[PDB]
Amino acid sequence: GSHMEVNLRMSWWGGNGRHQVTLKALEEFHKQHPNINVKAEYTGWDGHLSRLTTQIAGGTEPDVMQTNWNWLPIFSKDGTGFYNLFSVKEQLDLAQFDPKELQQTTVNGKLNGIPISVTAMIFYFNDATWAKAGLEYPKTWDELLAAGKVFKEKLGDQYYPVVLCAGQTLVLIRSYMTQKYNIPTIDEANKKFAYSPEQWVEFFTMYKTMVDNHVMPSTKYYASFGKSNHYEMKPWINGEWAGTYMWNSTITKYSDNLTKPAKLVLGPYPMLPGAKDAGLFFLPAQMLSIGKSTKHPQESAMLINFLLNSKEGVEALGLERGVPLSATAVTQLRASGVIKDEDPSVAGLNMALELPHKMTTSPYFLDWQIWSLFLDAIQYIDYGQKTVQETAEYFNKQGDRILKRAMRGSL
Ligand code: NA
Ligand code: NA
Ligand code: NA
């Protein structure tokens, strides 16, 4: 015999804003499932992965948990680290999602989590400065280059079409190489980067070409824009740095620091002639997953479904985790006015979802050691320690060593 009630545990992280709405959502869940209880185990980001790690190791994790995309390779290299969500297809309306984004959270045939929202880096431009320069936004890569020189001569040496940190520049070039070559960037199975030597040379050649054309400040100005914070620097506020390439889901920071009436507007995504693939880096912002060892996979799956697809759950959660991916979810929030097509974040996402997106991405491309190394490599170019060639060989070699380490055996 079993019991009158089912007891579930769920974990998530965030600020009080996120806590409040999910707490709310759990009351609504319990109203519809009065014999399913939920113990809410939540904290801020700091310390979270560490607590969950030690729980997951000893089979003590919650039934349902908010997870990060890059946790898949940590706890689920062979795809069995979390419960296979295809097995609770009956409780969990998978029809509300698409294969493109479900594939990112599938590992060795197993649906390891449901992406709550997705985001990708795209271009946003300052309309006032581009008006001053007398330019339309770039539709091609060469137009982006061409813009650099117009910005320099027609407005000044302090004006740039965009401002980019190392990480953005890395994702951006990757995007260009994907358009040109249609090859994957990380060779997953062999724990190494996939490009050939020539292509790494090309990669950095591209970086040099962008800088030489005044597309964005080089790393000699790294003292200036080298911040998870440069949307507060004067060049940003004043429209000197006239655009960025950035996750659509985190553009409001930049948008809000512009001296109005200047606005930050969605740009085209530049394409090579007859590219079959735009090469965006799509990234699920977070996921709901089910504990591998849950005694209640069905009820766990009901909770996830309720938070993501139900009217009440959807209404309560709002945008506290980004713009929902669930089709019923976004239809609901559009009708309620919560999601506004004119919001730069939503317009960018919409455009992004619609660009050709053949090639797929590895969580290891966003590894911070990798990003840190790319910053090193471009400075060696800007400060004259290495030619493009030498830098390329360097990045390929050290890049491989950082990967093998991060994908097992570190040490
Ligand atoms: Na019993
Ligand atoms: Na292509
Ligand atoms: Na929602």
CATH of the domain at 29: 3.40.190.10
Please identify, among 302, 335, 350, the residue that sits at the C-terminal boundary of a domain.
350
Contact 282, 120 (CB under 8 A): yes
Amino acid at 69: W
Number of neighbours of residue 346 by Cβ within 10 angstroms:
20
Q: Using the mean position of ligand 1's atoms as its centre, give its distance from the Cα of residue 4 in Å.
A: 8
- Phi (first) and psi of residue 133, to 5 degrees: -85, -10
| Statement to judge: residues 239 and 360 lie in one domain | yes
Q: Using the mean position of ligand 1's atoms as its centre, give its distance from the Cα of residue 8 in Å.
A: 17
Q: Using the mean position of ligand 1's atoms as its centre, give its distance from the Cα of residue 63 in Å.
A: 20
Q: Which residues contact 56 (CB under 8 A, 6 or more apart)?
A: 75, 81
Q: Encode burial over 373-384: b for 16+ CB neighbours within 10 A, e otherwise.
A: bbbbbbbbbbee
Q: Using the mean position of ligand 1's atoms as its centre, give its distance from the Cα of residue 293 in Å.
A: 20
Amino acid at 26: L
DSSP string, 65-116: EEE-GGGHHHH-TTS-SB--GGGGTTTS-GGGS-HHHHHTTEETTEE--EEE
Beta strands in 228-375 (DSSP E): 243-247, 264-266, 282-290
How many whole angstroms separate alpha carbon 293 and alpha carbon 9?
Answer: 12
| Statement to judge: residues 345 and 361 lie in one domain | no
How many whole angstroms separate alpha carbon 238 and alpha carbon 126?
Answer: 10
| Statement to judge: residues 96 and 30 lie in one domain | yes
How many whole angstroms separate alpha carbon 113 and alpha carbon 88?
Answer: 12
Q: Which residues contact 327 (CB under 8 A, 6 or more apart)?
A: 95, 96, 97
| Statement to judge: residues 320 and 201 lie in one domain | no
Q: Which ligand is nearest to the CA of 320?
A: 3
Q: Which ligand is nearest to the CA of 3?
A: 1
What would the two tokens of residue 344 be?
């730069």
For residue 293, CA distances in Å to 18, 62, 81, 82, 106 come to 27, 9, 9, 8, 18
Q: Using the mean position of ligand 2's atoms as its centre, give its distance from the Cα of residue 176 in Å.
A: 9
3-state secondary structure of 243: strand
Q: Using the mean position of ligand 3's atoms as its centre, give its distance from the Cα of residue 283 in Å.
A: 18
Contact 359, 277 (CB under 8 A): yes
Contact 359, 343 (CB under 8 A): no
For residue 212, which of 385, 381, 389, 393 has the smallest C-alpha distance?
A: 381
User: How many CA atoms does the CB half-sphere of 77 hold within 13 Å?
Assistant: 8
User: 268: which DSSP letter?
Assistant: P
| Statement to judge: residues 18 and 140 lie in one domain | no
3-state secondary structure of 298: helix
| Statement to judge: residues 383 and 263 lie in one domain | yes
Q: Using the mean position of ligand 3's atoms as its centre, give its distance from the Cα of residue 60 in Å.
A: 28
Please identify, among 305, 322, 350, the residue that sits at the C-terminal boundary of a domain.
350
264-266/36-43 β-pairing: unpaired
- Helix (H) / strand (E) containing 192: strand 192-193
Cis before 270 (ω within 30): no
Q: Using the mean position of ligand 3's atoms as its centre, give its distance from the Cα of residue 69 in Å.
A: 19
For residue 251, CA distances in Å to 22, 149, 175, 245 come to 24, 26, 19, 9
Q: Using the mean position of ligand 2's atoms as its centre, give its distance from the Cα of residue 178 in Å.
A: 6
Q: Which ligand is nearest to the CA of 280?
A: 2
Q: Using the mean position of ligand 2's atoms as its centre, give its distance from the Cα of residue 258 in Å.
A: 34
| Statement to judge: residues 267 and 130 lie in one domain | yes
| Statement to judge: residues 311 and 181 lie in one domain | no
3-state secondary structure of 376: helix
Q: Which ligand is nearest to the CA of 330?
A: 3
For residue 14, CA distances in Å to 47, 49, 208, 323, 359 come to 11, 12, 39, 16, 31
| Statement to judge: residues 224 and 141 lie in one domain | yes
How many whole angstroms separate alpha carbon 380 and alpha carbon 301?
Answer: 51
Place of tokens 């996120």: 18
| Statement to judge: residues 201 and 291 lie in one domain | no
How many whole angstroms separate alpha carbon 329 and alpha carbon 340?
Answer: 14
Q: Which ligand is nearest to the CA of 2?
A: 1
Please identify, among 321, 350, 379, the residue that sits at the C-terminal boundary of a domain.
350
Number of neighbours of residue 87 by Cβ within 10 angstroms:
15
Contact 406, 186 (CB under 8 A): no
Q: Which domain holds residue 151?
A: 117-284+352-411
For residue 60, CA distances in Å to 55, 56, 158, 222, 292 come to 5, 6, 55, 45, 10
What residues have their beta carbon closer than 5 A to ion ligand 3? 314, 317, 324
| Statement to judge: residues 289 and 276 lie in one domain | no
Long-range contacts of residues 50-55, Cβ cutoff 8 Å, at least 24 apart? 52/11
Helices in 133-196 by DSSP H: which ranges?
141-150, 166-181
Q: Using the mean position of ligand 1's atoms as its centre, give its distance from the Cα of residue 37 in Å.
A: 17
106-107/110-111 β-pairing: antiparallel
Q: Using the mean position of ligand 3's atoms as its centre, give its distance from the Cα of residue 305 in Å.
A: 12
Amino acid at 217: P
Place of tokens 């302090």: 158
How many whole angstroms separate alpha carbon 353 and alpha carbon 282?
Answer: 9
Contact 303, 21 (CB under 8 A): no
How many whole angstroms separate alpha carbon 111 and alpha carbon 93?
Answer: 13
- Phi (first) and psi of residue 148, to 5 degrees: -50, -50
Based on the number of CB atoms within 10 Å of its own CB, is 237 exposed (0-12), middle (13-18) or buried (19 or more)?
middle
| Statement to judge: residues 71 and 179 lie in one domain | no
Contact 61, 291 (CB under 8 A): yes
Q: Using the mean position of ligand 2's atoms as its centre, give its distance from the Cα of residue 186 in Å.
A: 17
Based on the number of CB atoms within 10 Å of its own CB, is 108 exposed (0-12), middle (13-18) or buried (19 or more)?
exposed
Specify the number of domains making up the chain: 2
Q: Which ligand is nearest to the CA of 312?
A: 3
Q: Encode burial over 245-279: b for 16+ CB neighbours within 10 A, e otherwise.
A: bbbbbebeebbeebeeebebbbbbbbbbeebebbb
User: How many CA atoms does the CB half-sphere of 380 hold within 13 Å?
Assistant: 18
- Helix (H) / strand (E) containing 7: strand 6-13
